[PDB]
């Protein structure tokens, strides 16, 4: 009834608590099945943590865990690919409440299946069952698409950038709460007890959407689910209509969004593996401060975005955001000490003002009745970006480990030169 922000807050809390606990269970079960009584992390680096020798069994269990995360994530991604683009275009024809209630129920169901597997110590393949069951009903991707479409359907043309930044800042606040309230909960009797908050958060989101949420689709029509006019409505969004030079901009902004969120997703994960690296060797509290400072960039940018719009357009704000991300990811790449590592975190205080800008510039190119289809496409792109970021950056970091640590961060900074060029070119050519 206030808005759809609490829905995304609870769903993001559920997802950000689910990821580390699920991979921790994968570590526990896969190690136990092979008689490996050892630490559940990857191999350490420097500061005497080891003797330099490699562990054939720990590396094998780590590879197994990475492969099983890949398997469950790809299964979820494919079923979400085929479900989000069916439930979004439908959502813009029947309303946003059903498509924000179904995925929350699916998330609660996968949380229940995960709890059943963790408590019964069942095979890790039944995690894939919960992932597919949630993915069919639309997953956290569909919560994202429905929330962004609801914000796009309840705001002006000028207010979309700020009202999307507000919701994305709520997304990141939920991420911070997950990171530093399941970070210090997963350590203390963790891995099962913190998982009850995933089910609790998903149930709370389902109840809030079903009861306390206010529908924003003004003239709700009568549409049939399972029609094939929902898969056609994302194709006749990118290729057929909007021929008046606003069809190239959809592809270019989708490309910029892909690269930008790929860089963000990869660089968050390498952050703790780097912080507790060889010349840093951060303790448990320093990396907690690091995670917090990484997840305060969200709100500091919901502030810098709103402040900078008083003098600039809504695109140069994103250009400034991409220079803050590049200065941070180049500084962090060259950080061999804690003042230089935390300066990089501080420099990225406007890093997250470019994703909401791209989302809004996409949402202002489509009709008011296609904000479901557009953000279904965007959610699918953000899932693919998560997968690609994981693969690329977890392949770069081990390889460029004895040559230059932080090269993954510098490569992410280099990749951010393409969204900046794309967005600057798009604005300059149109305004000329």
């Amino acid at each position: 009834a206030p808005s759809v922000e609490p829905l995304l807050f609870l769903a993001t809390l559920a997802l950000g608590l689910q990821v580390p606990l699920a991979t921790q269970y994968l570590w526990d079960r896969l190690g136990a099945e092979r008689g490996y009584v050892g630490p559940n992390a990857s191999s350490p680096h420097g500061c005497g943590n080891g003797s330099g020798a490699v562990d054939p069994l720990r590396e094998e269990v780590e590879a197994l865990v990475a492969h099983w995360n890949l398997c469950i994530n790809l299964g979820g991604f494919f079923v979400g690919l085929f479900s989000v683009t069916l439930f979004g275009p439908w959502s813009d024809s029947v309303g946003r409440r059903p498509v924000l209630v179904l995925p929350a129920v699916g998330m609660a169901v996968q949380a229940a299946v995960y709890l059943l597997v963790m408590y019964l110590r069942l095979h890790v393949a039944y995690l894939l069952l919960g992932r597919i069951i949630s993915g069919l009903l639309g997953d956290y991707n569909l919560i994202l698409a429905g929330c962004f479409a609801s914000v796009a359907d309840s705001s002006n043309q000028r207010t979309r950038t700020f009202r999307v930044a507000i919701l994305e800042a709520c997304l990141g606040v939920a991420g911070m709460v997950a990171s530093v309230g399941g970070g210090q909960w997963r350590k203390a009797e963790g891995y099962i007890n913190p998982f009850w908050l995933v089910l609790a958060a998903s149930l709370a989101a389902a109840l809030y959407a079903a009861l306390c949420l206010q529908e924003t689709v003004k003239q709700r029509r009568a549409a049939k689910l399972l029609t094939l006019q929902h898969y056609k409505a994302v194709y006749k969004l990118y290729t057929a209509p909007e021929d008046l030079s606003s069809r190239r901009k959809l592809a270019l902004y989708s490309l910029a969004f892909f690269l930008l969120v790929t860089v963000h997703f990869g660089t968050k994960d390498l952050y703790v593996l780097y912080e507790l690296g060889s010349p840093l060797c951060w303790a448990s509290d320093l990396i907690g401060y690091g995670s917090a400072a990484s997840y305060l960039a969200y709100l500091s940018s919901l502030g810098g975005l709103r402040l900078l719009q008083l003098c600039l357009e809504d695109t140069w704000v994103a250009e400034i955001g991409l220079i803050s991300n590049i200065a941070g990811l180049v500084v962090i790449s060259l950080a061999t000490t804690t003042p230089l590592m935390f300066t990089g975190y501080g420099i990225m205080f406007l890093s997250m003002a470019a994703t909401p800008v791209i989302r809004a510039k996409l949402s202002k190119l489509v009709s008011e009745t296609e904000q479901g289809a557009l953000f279904a496409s965007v959610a699918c792109v953000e899932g693919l970006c998560s997968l690609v970021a994981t693969g690329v950056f977890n392949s770069l970091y081990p390889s460029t480990l004895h040559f230059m640590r932080g090269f993954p961060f510098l490569f992410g900074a280099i990749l951010l030169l393409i969204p900046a060029a794309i967005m600057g070119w798009i604005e300059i050519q149109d305004s000329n």
Partner: nanobody, 117 residues
């Protein structure tokens, strides 16, 4: 933070070395405790682990019912007693201290040198 082990040394086969590991620099009552031996010309051979209480005690097959991990949160000295020592047990026994979390560091020890012969 340092975990210092001292129970090693030359013991004839059929020995009863009691390894100790005194942790100074953290709580030691919130950390899981392991035991690893890097045998000469090999890699780590993780031997045991124990939760901050003593409820989750896990071994490998080459030490099951033969090595007996133990910790004293009061004394802050993790132990490990070794029965039926064989010249296959010659190694450098380390003493790591994880948190059984994916965003927490490992604190290896210096490593004693058991030379069963």
């Amino acid at each position: 933070v340092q975990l210092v082990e001292s129970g090693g040394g030359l013991v004839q086969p059929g020995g009863s070395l009691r390894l100790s590991c005194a942790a100074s620099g953290f709580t030691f009552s919130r950390y899981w405790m392991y035991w690893v031996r890097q045998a000469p010309g090999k890699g780590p051979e993780w031997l045991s682990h124990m939760n901050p209480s003593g409820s989750d005690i896990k071994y490998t097959d080459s030490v099951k019912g033969r090595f007996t991990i133990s910790r004293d949160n009061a004394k802050n000295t993790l132990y490990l007693q070794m029965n039926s020592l064989k010249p296959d047990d010659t190694a450098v026994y380390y003493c790591v201290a994880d948190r059984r979390a994916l965003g927490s560091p490992e604190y290896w020890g210096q490593g004693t040198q058991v030379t069963v012969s």
